[PDB]
């Protein structure tokens, strides 16, 4: 599982640090052991569509 470049969210999601929002909180969060297992459970259902 490949993360994107970390300079993408740093020039366009947290450009102004005076404010916060719903997106600007979630960037500083890491997946747990089971919340990564749900991402593995997402991509199984994208490959077998119906």
């Amino acid at each position: 599982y490949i993360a994107p470049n970390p300079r993408i969210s740093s020039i366009t999601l947290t450009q102004r640090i005076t404010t916060t929002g719903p997106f600007a909180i979630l960037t500083g969060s890491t997946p747990t052991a089971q919340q990564l297992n749900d991402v593995r459970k997402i991509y199984l259902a994208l490959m077998f569509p119906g």
Binding site: A24, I25, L26, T27, G28, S29, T30
Partner: peptide, 23 residues
Amino acid sequence: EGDVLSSDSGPLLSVFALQEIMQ
């Protein structure tokens, strides 16, 4: 008590969830 700590670089956004270990 019972607090945990890991390697984090988000100074604001992860310590919000650190009080969730307190509460």
